[PDB]
Design an enzyme around this catalytic site. Structure first.
Site, PDB file in Angstrom:
ATOM      1  CE  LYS A  43      38.750  31.456  28.402  1.00  0.00           C
ATOM      2  NZ  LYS A  43      37.851  31.471  29.664  1.00  0.00           N
ATOM      3  N   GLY A  71      32.301  34.244  29.054  1.00  0.00           N
ATOM      4  CA  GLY A  71      31.866  33.864  27.692  1.00  0.00           C
ATOM      5  C   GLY A  71      32.922  33.306  26.762  1.00  0.00           C
ATOM      6  CG  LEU A  72      35.360  29.658  25.380  1.00  0.00           C
ATOM      7  CD1 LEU A  72      36.008  28.940  26.568  1.00  0.00           C
ATOM      8  CD2 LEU A  72      34.473  28.684  24.600  1.00  0.00           C
ATOM      9  CB  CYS A  78      31.461  22.619  26.121  1.00  0.00           C
ATOM     10  SG  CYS A  78      31.371  20.796  26.091  1.00  0.00           S
ATOM     11  CB  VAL A 103      34.727  21.353  40.651  1.00  0.00           C
ATOM     12  CG1 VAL A 103      34.425  19.988  41.308  1.00  0.00           C
ATOM     13  CG2 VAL A 103      34.895  22.437  41.718  1.00  0.00           C
ATOM     14  N   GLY A 160      39.614  24.350  43.110  1.00  0.00           N
ATOM     15  CA  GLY A 160      38.503  25.042  43.759  1.00  0.00           C
ATOM     16  C   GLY A 160      38.879  25.458  45.156  1.00  0.00           C
ATOM     17  N   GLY A 173      42.697  29.112  40.696  1.00  0.00           N
ATOM     18  CA  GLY A 173      41.937  30.011  39.871  1.00  0.00           C
ATOM     19  C   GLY A 173      41.888  31.390  40.489  1.00  0.00           C
ATOM     20  CB  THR A 174      39.270  32.783  42.800  1.00  0.00           C
ATOM     21  OG1 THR A 174      38.116  32.423  42.034  1.00  0.00           O
ATOM     22  CG2 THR A 174      39.020  34.078  43.473  1.00  0.00           C
TER      23      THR A 174
HETATM   24  C1  LIG Z   1      38.020  34.447  34.967  1.00  0.00           C
HETATM   25  C2  LIG Z   1      37.815  32.939  34.906  1.00  0.00           C
HETATM   26  C3  LIG Z   1      37.871  32.257  33.705  1.00  0.00           C
HETATM   27  C4  LIG Z   1      37.763  30.878  33.619  1.00  0.00           C
HETATM   28  N1  LIG Z   1      37.761  30.246  32.418  1.00  0.00           N
HETATM   29  C5  LIG Z   1      37.805  28.873  32.399  1.00  0.00           C
HETATM   30  C6  LIG Z   1      38.055  28.136  31.147  1.00  0.00           C
HETATM   31  O1  LIG Z   1      38.343  28.853  30.127  1.00  0.00           O
HETATM   32  N2  LIG Z   1      38.084  26.868  31.220  1.00  0.00           N
HETATM   33  C7  LIG Z   1      37.836  26.163  32.360  1.00  0.00           C
HETATM   34  O2  LIG Z   1      37.921  24.941  32.372  1.00  0.00           O
HETATM   35  N3  LIG Z   1      37.550  26.766  33.561  1.00  0.00           N
HETATM   36  C8  LIG Z   1      37.555  28.110  33.606  1.00  0.00           C
HETATM   37  N4  LIG Z   1      37.371  28.780  34.806  1.00  0.00           N
HETATM   38  C9  LIG Z   1      37.166  27.989  35.989  1.00  0.00           C
HETATM   39  C10 LIG Z   1      38.442  27.732  36.748  1.00  0.00           C
HETATM   40  O3  LIG Z   1      39.330  26.951  35.969  1.00  0.00           O
HETATM   41  C11 LIG Z   1      38.182  27.026  38.069  1.00  0.00           C
HETATM   42  O4  LIG Z   1      37.621  25.741  37.736  1.00  0.00           O
HETATM   43  C12 LIG Z   1      37.207  27.789  39.009  1.00  0.00           C
HETATM   44  O5  LIG Z   1      37.529  29.191  39.096  1.00  0.00           O
HETATM   45  C13 LIG Z   1      37.274  27.216  40.449  1.00  0.00           C
HETATM   46  O6  LIG Z   1      38.625  27.347  40.963  1.00  0.00           O
HETATM   47  P1  LIG Z   1      38.978  28.531  42.093  1.00  0.00           P
HETATM   48  O7  LIG Z   1      38.068  28.302  43.238  1.00  0.00           O
HETATM   49  O8  LIG Z   1      40.402  28.394  42.318  1.00  0.00           O
HETATM   50  O9  LIG Z   1      38.626  29.815  41.369  1.00  0.00           O
HETATM   51  C14 LIG Z   1      37.534  30.142  34.870  1.00  0.00           C
HETATM   52  C15 LIG Z   1      37.495  30.810  36.049  1.00  0.00           C
HETATM   53  C16 LIG Z   1      37.633  32.192  36.105  1.00  0.00           C
HETATM   54  C17 LIG Z   1      37.539  32.864  37.439  1.00  0.00           C
HETATM   55  O1  LIG Z   2      34.741  31.560  29.894  1.00  0.00           O
HETATM   56  C1  LIG Z   2      33.902  31.301  30.796  1.00  0.00           C
HETATM   57  O2  LIG Z   2      32.905  32.023  31.105  1.00  0.00           O
HETATM   58  C2  LIG Z   2      34.135  30.133  31.640  1.00  0.00           C
HETATM   59  N1  LIG Z   2      34.114  30.447  33.020  1.00  0.00           N
HETATM   60  C3  LIG Z   2      34.259  29.446  33.966  1.00  0.00           C
HETATM   61  O3  LIG Z   2      34.163  29.663  35.222  1.00  0.00           O
HETATM   62  N2  LIG Z   2      34.359  28.177  33.525  1.00  0.00           N
HETATM   63  C4  LIG Z   2      34.445  27.825  32.141  1.00  0.00           C
HETATM   64  O4  LIG Z   2      34.582  26.639  31.900  1.00  0.00           O
HETATM   65  C5  LIG Z   2      34.251  28.860  31.218  1.00  0.00           C
HETATM   66  C6  LIG Z   2      34.244  28.540  29.755  1.00  0.00           C
HETATM   67  C7  LIG Z   2      32.963  27.717  29.524  1.00  0.00           C
HETATM   68  C8  LIG Z   2      31.982  28.600  29.232  1.00  0.00           C
HETATM   69  C9  LIG Z   2      31.307  29.309  30.236  1.00  0.00           C
HETATM   70  C10 LIG Z   2      30.310  30.268  29.923  1.00  0.00           C
HETATM   71  C11 LIG Z   2      29.955  30.574  28.568  1.00  0.00           C
HETATM   72  C12 LIG Z   2      28.960  31.559  28.252  1.00  0.00           C
HETATM   73  C13 LIG Z   2      28.328  32.321  29.284  1.00  0.00           C
HETATM   74  C14 LIG Z   2      27.369  33.281  28.958  1.00  0.00           C
HETATM   75  C15 LIG Z   2      27.072  33.555  27.639  1.00  0.00           C
HETATM   76  C16 LIG Z   2      27.704  32.859  26.589  1.00  0.00           C
HETATM   77  C17 LIG Z   2      28.637  31.880  26.882  1.00  0.00           C
HETATM   78  C18 LIG Z   2      30.684  29.874  27.566  1.00  0.00           C
HETATM   79  C19 LIG Z   2      31.657  28.924  27.892  1.00  0.00           C
END
Ligand SMILES: Cc1cc2nc3c(=O)[nH]c(=O)nc-3n(C[C@H](O)[C@H](O)[C@H](O)COP(=O)(O)O)c2cc1C
Ligand SMILES: O=C(O)c1[nH]c(=O)[nH]c(=O)c1CCc1ccc(-c2ccccc2)cc1
Ligand SMILES: Cc1cc2nc3c(=O)[nH]c(=O)nc-3n(C[C@H](O)[C@H](O)[C@H](O)COP(=O)(O)O)c2cc1C
Ligand SMILES: O=C(O)c1[nH]c(=O)[nH]c(=O)c1CCc1ccc(-c2ccccc2)cc1
Lengths: 313, 313
Positions: B44, B71-72, B131, B194, B250, B272-273
C-alpha cells in the site's frame, strides 16, 4: 408530467439532442435530426474551409463505447451558416451551430459572420474548445491562457450569448481553474461537459491491431466508458458556475443515464455514441424511459430534480 | 510452457501482481498476496506516519468498475519497511514497496531509509506521483516542474533503480512532456501506467445520491471504464521510453485484457479493481487464460509479442 424546458430564450420540447459530430454533417443528417423527436440539434463542428478529415477507418464502436479520430471532416462554415440562415425550420426545434476553428483568428472570422444570423433567426453558438491549437501544445481547453484568449476574442467579435464545449478534466485544481476562466465571460451562458476522453487506445486481441488508422490508433473515447467522468464534470461546473447552464454529454444510453446527468446539474442532455449506434429512434426511447423514472418518483418537471444529487452526510 | 520472466535483476514466475492499494495494507493482506499465484506483490502506498484515511463509504464497485477516495489509509512507513526487512519471504516472489509522501521532504526521508534495505534484501521502490502538491496546483504528476523536482531529489536521496506510478494523461503533448521528464532520470527503470482516472462521479438513480462519502462523491475510477485509457498510456510511454520498462495497470479482468496490455508494451501487469472484487484466486485464472491465448496464437514467450501491437498503414 413534462419534459419541456425554456432556456436561452428558446423553448425545448425535451432535453435531448445529438452530440456535435454525430448525425449532423450534411443537409441530409440535419433534416434527419430535425425530423426526429429530439428537443434540439447541433451541427458538426466546422472550419472556414471544407475538410475531408482523417483517413479511414476513423471511428469504431464496441459494447462499452466508441473511439474516434475523425479529424474534423465537415462541409465548411458557409454550408452550416446557410443551413442556419435559409434551410432550418425553427418551428420544429432550436438549432445550435458548433464551430471549431484551428486558430483564434479562424473562430473570430466565423463568429463575426454568424452574429447577424444568430440575432435574426435565433441559432445558438457552441464553441468547441477541445480542439487543436498549435501542434505540440495541448488542446485549447487544456491551455488555460489560450482558452482565455479564445474567449476574450470570440466574446468581442460575436457580442451575443454563446456556449462552450469542454473536454473532461481529472484534477480538482483544473476544475477550479477552468471554471474561473469561464466565469470571466458573462456572454458564456452554457457549458457542455464533456467532449471525448482524449487519446484512448483500443486494441483488438484477435488481430493484435489497433482499430483506427489515424495517430497509431489513439483517439477520443465515448460511450459507457465515460459516464462517471461526464457526470463528474457536469456536477463540477454546475457547482462552480452558478450563473451559467450546464449541458451534459457522455455515456447516455438510457433515460436512467439522462436522469443521472440531470441530477448532476444538466439542462440539455446530448447523445453521441448511442445515437451513432442506434439511430434517431433513440430519442423516443429516451423520452419514454426518462418519463417512466419521473412517474415512479413522483416528479412532474425536470426542475424538480435538476442539480439535486445528494451527497453523503 | 510457463510465463516466468526476469526484470530489474529479479526473477518473476509470471507477469501478474496486485495494483498498489488493493490487498496490501496489512500484514495479513501481504501474507495473502505472498501466498497467491501472483508473480510479485506491491505494498500500500505509505506515508511516514500511519493514516486512518477518509470517512466510509470510500470504495464502491459496479459491473463496469470502481470508484474510490480512500485517502491513503496505511500503517505507516515503519510498518512497510519492517515487512520488507524482516517478514517478507523473498524466496516466494519479489516485493515492491510504494511510497506516497505528502511532500518532497517526506519522500526523501523515507527513501533514504529504504535504500539499505533495497541493497540488502532487493525490495523495489515504486514512487507514487499522484501525491500532494503546493497551493493551487494539481497533483504532482500533472505539474511537470514539480515532477522534475521530486525525481531529482529522490534520485539523489535513494541512489538505486526505482520506478514511478503515473496518473493517466489524455493529450499527446502531455505524453511528450511527461516522458521527456522521466527520461531525464536514469535511475527511473520502470513506469507503471496507470493510476485511477481521477475525479469521476458515480450516482445511484434509486437513491439519487452519490455512492462514496468523501469529496462530495468524487473519486478515482478503476476497472472496465479505464482499459482503453490504460492501454494508451502504456503504449505512449513504451514508445517514448525505450530504456525503461513499462508496467501496465488498469482494467485487467481476464487473460485477454492482460494480453492487450502486453501487446501495448507492458512487462508486468497489475490488477486492482478485479482483484478487489474476485479475490486472489484471480491470479490462477489470469495465468491460465493468458497461456491459452498464447497457445492458440503459437506464442511461446511474452517477448515474442510485447509491444508488438500493429498499426494500420
Ligand atoms: C481501493 C483502492 C486503493 C488504491 N490505492 C492506491 C495506492 O495506495 N497507491 C497507488 O499507486 N494506487 C492506488 N490505487 C490505484 C490502483 O493501483 C490502480 O492504479 C487503479 O485501481 C487502476 O487499476 P484497475 O483498473 O485494475 O483498478 C488504488 C485503487 C483502489 C481501487
Ligand atoms: O488512497 C487513495 O485514495 C488512492 N486511491 C487511488 O486510486 N490511487 C492512489 O494513488 C491513492 C493514494 C493517493 C492518494 C489519493 C487520494 C488522497 C486523498 C483524497 C481525498 C482526501 C484526502 C486525500 C490521498 C492520496
Ligand atoms: C464520430 C464522432 C464525431 C465527433 N465530432 C465532434 C465534433 O465535431 N465536435 C464536438 O464538439 N464533439 C465531437 N464529438 C464528441 C461528442 O460530441 C461527444 O462529446 C462525445 O462522443 C461523448 O459523448 P458520448 O459518450 O455520448 O459519445 C464527436 C464524437 C464522435 C463519436
Ligand atoms: O472531428 C473529430 O475528430 C472530433 N472528435 C471528437 O471526439 N471531438 C471533437 O471535438 C472533434 C473535433 C475536434 C478535433 C479533434 C481531432 C482532430 C485531429 C486528430 C488527429 C489528427 C488530426 C486532427 C481535430 C479536431
Amino acid at each position: 408530467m413534462c419534459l419541456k424546458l425554456n432556456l436561452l430564450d428558446h423553448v425545448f420540447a425535451n432535453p435531448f439532442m445529438n452530440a456535435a459530430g454525430v448525425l449532423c454533417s450534411t443537409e441530409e443528417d440535419l433534416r434527419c435530426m430535425t425530423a426526429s423527436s429530439s428537443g434540439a440539434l447541433v451541427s458538426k463542428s466546422c472550419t472556414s474551409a471544407p475538410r475531408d478529415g482523417n483517413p479511414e477507418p476513423r471511428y469504431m464502436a464496441f459494447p462499452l463505447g466508441s473511439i474516434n479520430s475523425m479529424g474534423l471532416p465537415n462541409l465548411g462554415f458557409d454550408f452550416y451558416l446557410k443551413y442556419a440562415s435559409d434551410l432550418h425550420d425553427y418551428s420544429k426545434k432550436p438549432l445550435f451551430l458548433s464551430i471549431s476553428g484551428l486558430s483564434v483568428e479562424e473562430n473570430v472570422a466565423m463568429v463575426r459572420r454568424l452574429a447577424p444570423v444568430a440575432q435574426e433567426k435565433g441559432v445558438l453558438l457552441e464553441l468547441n474548445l477541445s480542439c487543436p491549437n498549435v501542434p505540440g501544445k495541448p488542446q485549447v481547453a487544456y491551455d488555460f491562457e489560450a482558452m482565455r484568449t479564445y474567449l476574450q476574442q470570440v466574446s468581442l467579435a460575436y457580442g451575443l450569448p454563446f456556449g462552450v464545449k469542454m473536454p473532461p478534466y481529472f484534477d480538482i485544481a483544473h476544475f477550479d481553474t477552468a471554471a474561473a476562466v469561464l466565469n470571466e465571460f458573462p456572454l458564456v451562458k452554457f457549458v457542455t461537459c464533456v467532449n471525448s476522453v482524449g487519446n484512448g487506445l483500443v486494441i483488438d486481441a484477435e488481430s493484435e491491431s489497433v482499430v483506427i488508422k489515424p495517430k497509431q490508433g489513439f483517439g477520443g473515447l465515448g460511450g459507457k466508458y465515460i459516464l462517471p467522468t461526464a457526470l463528474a464534470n457536469v456536477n463540477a461546473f454546475y457547482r462552480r458556475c452558478p450563473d451559467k447552464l450546464v449541458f451534459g454529454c457522455g455515456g447516455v444510453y438510457s433515460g436512467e443515464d439522462a436522469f443521472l446527468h440531470i441530477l448532476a446539474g444538466a439542462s440539455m442532455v446530448q447523445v453521441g455514441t448511442a445515437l451513432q449506434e442506434e439511430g434517431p429512434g433513440i430519442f423516443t426511447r429516451l423520452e419514454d424511459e426518462l418519463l417512466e423514472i419521473m412517474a415512479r418518483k413522483g416528479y412532474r418537471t425536470l426542475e424538480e430534480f435538476r442539480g439535486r444529487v445528494k451527497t453523503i452526510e
